[PDB]
Amino acid sequence: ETFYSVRMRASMNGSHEDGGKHISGGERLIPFHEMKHTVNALLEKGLSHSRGKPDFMQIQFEEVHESIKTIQPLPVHTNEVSCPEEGQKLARLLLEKEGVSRDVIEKAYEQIPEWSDVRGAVLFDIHTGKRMDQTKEKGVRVSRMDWPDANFEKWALHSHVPAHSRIKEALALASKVSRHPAVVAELCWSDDPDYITGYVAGKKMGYQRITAMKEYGTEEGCRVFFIDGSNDVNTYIHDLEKQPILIEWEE
Amino acid sequence: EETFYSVRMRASMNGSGGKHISGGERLIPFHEMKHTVNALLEKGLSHSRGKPDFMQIQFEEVHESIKTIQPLPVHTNEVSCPEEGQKLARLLLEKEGVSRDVIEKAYEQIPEWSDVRGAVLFDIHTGKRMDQTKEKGVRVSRMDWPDANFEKWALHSHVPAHSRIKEALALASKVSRHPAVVAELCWSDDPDYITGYVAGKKMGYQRITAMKEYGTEEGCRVFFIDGSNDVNTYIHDLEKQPILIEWEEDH
Numbered sequence: 396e397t398f399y400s401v402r403m404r405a406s407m408n409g410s411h412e413d414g415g416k417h418i419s420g421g422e423r424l425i426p427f428h429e430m431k432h433t434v435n436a437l438l439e440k441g442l443s444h445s446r447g448k449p450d451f452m453q454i455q456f457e458e459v460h461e462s463i464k465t466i467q468p469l470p471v472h473t474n475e476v477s478c479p480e481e482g483q484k485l486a487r488l489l490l491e492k493e494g495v496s497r498d499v500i501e502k503a504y505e506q507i508p509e510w511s512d513v514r515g516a517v518l519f520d521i522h523t524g525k526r527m528d529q530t531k532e533k534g535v536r537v538s539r540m541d542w543p544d545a546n547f548e549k550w551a552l553h554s555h556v557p558a559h560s561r562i563k564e565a566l567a568l569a570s571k572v573s574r575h576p577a578v579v580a581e582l583c584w585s586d587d588p589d590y591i592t593g594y595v596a597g598k599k600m601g602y603q604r605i606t607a608m609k610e611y612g613t614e615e616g617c618r619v620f621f622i623d624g625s626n627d628v629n630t631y632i633h634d635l636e637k638q639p640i641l642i643e644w645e646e
Numbered sequence: 647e648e649t650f651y652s653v654r655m656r657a658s659m660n661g662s663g664g665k666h667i668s669g670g671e672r673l674i675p676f677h678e679m680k681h682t683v684n685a686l687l688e689k690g691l692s693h694s695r696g697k698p699d700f701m702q703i704q705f706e707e708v709h710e711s712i713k714t715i716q717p718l719p720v721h722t723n724e725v726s727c728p729e730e731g732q733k734l735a736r737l738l739l740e741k742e743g744v745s746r747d748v749i750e751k752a753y754e755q756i757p758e759w760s761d762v763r764g765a766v767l768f769d770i771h772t773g774k775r776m777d778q779t780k781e782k783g784v785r786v787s788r789m790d791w792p793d794a795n796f797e798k799w800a801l802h803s804h805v806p807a808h809s810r811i812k813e814a815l816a817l818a819s820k821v822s823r824h825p826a827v828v829a830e831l832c833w834s835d836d837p838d839y840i841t842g843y844v845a846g847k848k849m850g851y852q853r854i855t856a857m858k859e860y861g862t863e864e865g866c867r868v869f870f871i872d873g874s875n876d877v878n879t880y881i882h883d884l885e886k887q888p889i890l891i892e893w894e895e896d897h
């Protein structure tokens with residue numbers, strides 16, 4: 396059966412390219428017969444965003460010719476913290492636990508404010524202590540991963556986590572990304588003003604949720620992948636953009 | 647001054663060197679966005695040229711102010727076969743002001759332009775193609791015709807209220823208005839529609855009921871240009887100038 400990559404991005408004050416504000420992004424992986432439902436889902440997701448009404452949006456589909464790999468979601472643990480500063484401290488400890496040196500963590504945190512506007516993810520090289528990709532404000536956009544809702548809902552029931560598509564999306568991405576042999580860890584929180592939970596993820600500790608990573612009403616987010624590998628960055632960028640992943644949980 | 651949006655679509659098969667299946671352009675208020683994205687989607691998905699494996703749909707705010715014009719006057723020439731239609735087409739182009747030699751040269755090149763995805767600009771002073779877009783063609787966009795007014799026009803005009811005619815006539819009308827455009831020649835690349843037209847400022851929109859045989863995918867869109875200025879000026883006008891059609895019943 397043939398699957399399709401469906402992607403969306405939306406911005407205001409022009410195309411993202413112009414120097415507009417990123418509003419929303421989406422990526423889906425589906426059989427052809429879900430095309431209409433999926434295009435509408437992405438349209439609606441872009442139109443009803445807390446960051447604002449877009450004046451630019453692109454939606455796109457194409458056939459995927461690489462074969463699909465189906466994986467488990469990462470194990471999930473929720474860390475309850477009382478404030479953003481405690482969440483950020485915990486985040487740094489978790490990154491160090493997973494194998495990132497403290498020094499590389501500090502260098503990344505120096506740039507993170509600069510990367511608030513990035514539309515995808517930043518790749519940070521642990522060998523240089525510096526950004527590895529050259530996409531600048533565009534970022535690297537991981538795509539061609541998805542998680543059928545029914546299975547995701549079964550997973551959320553069991554995990555005592557709410558069945559919000561925001562978590563599905565985050566965990567599908569974290570799971571695809573941590574599977575990459577060159578990715579040691581990911582740090583994330585949302586650019587949406589209305590969601591303060593973030594996470595750190597890696598192969599050892601799984602998907603570590605942190606219930607407060609920033610204040611409500613702020614639009615600064617973070618998506619950094621810490622890279623430890625022997626290959627060029629374009630190889631890895633191609634892996635993240637092109638490798639098709641479906642999530643399927645079983646107990 | 648109400649805000650309008652350019653909504654565009656293109657679809658192809660065997661990739662993004664692929665076969666062009668469908669193209670669309672709309673110009674609408676924001677509240678029509680959902681209906682319009684779905685219309686373009688469905689248009690692309692149910693095309694007689696085939697099922698796409700690639701599609702892009704895009705919207706953006708238009709910042710130039712909209713000009714509203716009347717549609718060209720319409721006349722329908724009933725012919726009994728394609729060869730009679732083509733012969734009429736050439737007579738009408740000549741009557742509107744294109745010299746015979748320029749018509750003959752263009753007809754010799756029309757077969758090699760079957761694959762062009764937009765329009766060809768043909769210079770009447772040089773008897774040569776003027777634009778440099780090759781297989782891409784020049785894609786006129788940011789024109790539309792609100793459905794209600796189009797339906798009233800079609801009722802009165804004794805022409806069927808098909809969106810194909812709406813789209814053709816909105817384009818022909820925007821294009822003929824351009825002071826450098828002497829005439830247009832058109833028939834569809836769709837295997838399932840053999841009606842075509844020639845259009846110009848004097849003769850209006852002259853429909854010709856048979857311009858090719860059913861089941862053929864060779865189409866034509868040629869703009870005959872009489873102009874001193876940089877072709878890129880004209881191209882920019884055709885791509886960027888926002889036009890709405892309003893037929894005035896009161897007349």
Ligand SMILES: Nc1ncnc2c1ncn2[C@@H]1O[C@H](COP(=O)(O)OC(=O)CCCCCC(=O)O)[C@@H](O)[C@H]1O
Binds near residue numbers: 420592
């Ligand atoms: N597909 C992607 N590829 C690379 N970076 C991405 C991608 N998607 C999002 N990002 C980056 O992350 C930033 C925020 O993305 P968002 O979709 O706003 O991210 C979230 O909602 C994070 C929620 C995690 C906690 C969920 C939970 O377990 O309760 C976003 O602006 C991008 O810069």
Ligand SMILES: Nc1ncnc2c1ncn2[C@@H]1O[C@H](COP(=O)(O)OC(=O)CCCCCC(=O)O)[C@@H](O)[C@H]1O
Binds near residue numbers: 764832
């Ligand atoms: N927006 C455009 N800008 C430039 N060229 C275009 C555009 N739209 C279509 N074309 C070119 O023309 C070709 C034919 O497009 P189509 O939309 O398939 O053409 C038609 O339906 C023609 C119908 C005319 C008769 C209507 C009537 O019954 O009164 C198409 O493949 C392109 O090469």
Ligand SMILES: [Mg+2]
Binds near residue numbers: 420421564
């Ligand atoms: Mg997202």
Ligand SMILES: [Mg+2]
Binds near residue numbers: 418586
């Ligand atoms: Mg966001």
Ligand SMILES: [Mg+2]
Binds near residue numbers: 669670813
């Ligand atoms: Mg068309």
Ligand SMILES: [Mg+2]
Binds near residue numbers: 835
């Ligand atoms: Mg066509």
